[PDB]
UniProtKB/TrEMBL annotation, chain A:
Belongs to the class-V pyridoxal-phosphate-dependent aminotransferase family. Csd subfamily. The keyword Iron-sulfur does not apply. The chain holds residues 152 to 556 of 559 of the full protein. It comes from Mycolicibacterium smegmatis (strain ATCC 700084 / mc(2)155) (Mycobacterium smegmatis). One of its GO terms (molecular function) is cysteine desulfurase activity. This is cysteine desulfurase. The keyword Transferase applies. Its EC number is 2.8.1.7.
Length: 405, 405
């Protein structure tokens, strides 16, 4: 299957898509919050627990060798899918938020001091804001925020103007989870390096929607969450260039990250072990590897083109409903279609849509600053994935129209 | 105690190694899962999967119900007074790092003293060493006798007016020693310290009542109590949590974010940054219900019988020395064999189908205290049998009667 792309064939792999809501078909437009899982991922987890479950270290015994094989294969699946040079540059942790906190606490506390500057974009999710605020109060570093225009495009000229001799770190989202804006990460990384800064890229909403090649990109850190790319909850990745991880001290301490422990002093292993303390989340890493293989079978460029067709279809029909204002109309977008409706609270629109079976989020989407920049406290945010259909979009448009009338 | 009916629930127990039935004596590293836990995870992914916040939409409400019920199952099972005292994270190691970085960062300064025991797992050593090196806090280690018993007089002699924290294991993963945690807590409190209890090896083997114990913190890992990987718990008394600043920052733990500053939620949200591992918490709740149906006092009695049966029969083999003969033990039976290195013994046992750990068990200091670099360590769980113990005893005696190294 999936030699040719067909959305009904694809949808058939996702069991929850046959679920019913209030007597109506489920329409999952909440992909920017989390995605639904293919049967192969569910079955990969079941198979691991029934046939492979153990802590790792292949010399121990048979099941330990099975679990070790699966864990190493999962790390390699991540390395291959994002184009990292080495599996030693792939760190498993719980998700994007833990990965950014790792970089902030460990790398930031080692390298930042008073007056040093961190540049983030106005488009950031809270996961890429709060850790820099914590670090900035701890170290005296100054946090600068690169601005956007009213359509939500990052302004590259103002961004370059914020860079200077005090710039040590740029942390930028590749895809805004609230507006859908795609940012020019190649340019951001090149500019950051030109001024001597390390560059972290928040890829939680780019990795499901466009091909990623971190080696070509050159970013020093790249982070994402497994549950937003059809994988299990509880698993995510920090990619770090070998030289960036070498200058990052250990963060969490305990088993696996040590080479030798005495009561007076411990020595630490190299990466990836250096940053993985305690028993890893072995089963969900293995499930994430299965999710990556599923996405590769379908094809990330085919996913990107199909999802682009969905967004291109939905946006004008939504915008033509009287009272609707689209929020986020950047030159390039992926998946997310925030809007508001005059005279109606976003949350009541979300609840009416749920009454139609349609799942969306209405709220600030853990991105209050960008919404305030747009003059708003909340938006209604359908977000599309490659198992969504044009027919589902039609149902959603009719529902919004009936609310507006 | 019907071990055969219980064994029927664990599918992996049907696996074979070298054409021989698997014998899982590696429970101190991780446990195997009942089909109810595996199925609970599958059911979640196929029918309930969503981020939380029940007002959003139907699946979000299903996910919120399941996550709240998991937190309440943990609260009930460990005897905590409030669900707000239960923090979900990856495992024991993350929980201890939370207390060390956040509580310790605020409360352990130059000259303040930390008391741990000689029995600690690396997870309850390295975080205190890292904190100590950051702040000038002083780490003291309470000794044991040659049998592996905690010496209560010497422990109390370590306490004084500068003791801020006692961090003690309840059950040693390398020796099986059960420590007198009620005495430890009462003594620490008398001298003015908070007390953290490492329960990763006590919670599967004996009843836990943290409100009656009075411990300030209690930590454990889901995968050592028949649950999924990637999930564990920090319990903290609400007054202890009230004096603990946030650790990781991001979504869920904030109440409001502006570019200037972020305000934080109260507990448990305060300590859970980002998307939680919803599915594995749900699976851990299912594991807790399984243990509760069997009965933790019945499990404790049966496992005590297993250990009592095994210890003299293993000790009677010429060449064998038992490592850890404390007055009260649970699960673990470390030993060494003259003329054989532990790892080779472990591999030979695996050739017979028997899974054990051979090594330092992430507890190098206690093994050095015993004069050793490594031990062979079977550890028993309530799906193990006397027959499996007989196979193990015969395999050890064949190794002992064979050629030395």
């Amino acid at each position: 299957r999936h030699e040719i792309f067909d959305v009904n064939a694809i949808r058939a792999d996702f069991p929850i898509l046959r679920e019913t809501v209030n007597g109506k078909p489920l329409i999952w437009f909440d992909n920017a919050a989390t995605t639904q899982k293919p049967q192969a991922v569910i079955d990969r987890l079941s198979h691991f627990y029934a046939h492979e479950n153990s802590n790792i270290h292949r010399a121990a015994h048979e099941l330990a060798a099975r679990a070790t094989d699966a864990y190493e294969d999962a790390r390699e699946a991540v390395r291959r899918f994002i184009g990292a040079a080495k599996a030693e540059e792939i760190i498993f942790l719980r998700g994007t938020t833990e990965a950014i906190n790792l970089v902030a606490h460990a790398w930031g506390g080692k390298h930042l001091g008073p007056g040093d500057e961190i540049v983030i974009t106005h488009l950031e999710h809270h996961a890429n804001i709060v850790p820099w605020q914590l670090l900035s109060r701890q170290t005296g570093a100054v946090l600068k925020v690169a601005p956007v225009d009213d359509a939500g495009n990052l302004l590259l000229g103002e961004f370059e103007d914020l860079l200077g001799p005090r710039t040590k770190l740029v942390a930028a989202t590749q895809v805004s989870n609230a507006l859908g804006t795609v940012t020019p990460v190649e340019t951001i990384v090149e500019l950051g390096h030109r001024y001597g800064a390390r560059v972290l890229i928040d890829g939680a909403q780019s990795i499901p929607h466009m091909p990623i090649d971190v080696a070509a990109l050159g970013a020093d850190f790249f982070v994402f969450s497994g549950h937003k790319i059809y994988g299990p909850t509880g698993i995510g990745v920090l990619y770090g260039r070998e030289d960036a991880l070498a200058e990052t001290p250990p963060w969490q301490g305990g088993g696996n990250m040590i080479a030798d422990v005495t009561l007076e002093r411990s020595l630490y292993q190299g990466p990836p072990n250096k940053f993985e303390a305690g028993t890893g989340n072995i089963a969900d890493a293995v499930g994430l590897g299965e999710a990556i293989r599923y996405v590769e079978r379908v094809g990330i460029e085919r996913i990107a083109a199909y999802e682009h067709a969905l967004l291109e279809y939905a946006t004008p029909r939504l915008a033509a409903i009287p009272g609707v204002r689209i929020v986020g109309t950047a030159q390039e977008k992926a998946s997310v279609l925030s809007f508001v409706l005059a005279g109606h609270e976003p949350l009541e629109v979300g609840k009416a849509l749920n009454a139609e079976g349609i799942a969306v989020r209405a709220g600030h989407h853990c991105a209050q600053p960008i919404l305030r920049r747009m003059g708003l406290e909340a938006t209604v945010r359908p977000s599309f994935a490659f198992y969504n259909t044009f027919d589902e979009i039609d149902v959603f448009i009719d529902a919004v129209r009936r609310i507006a009338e």
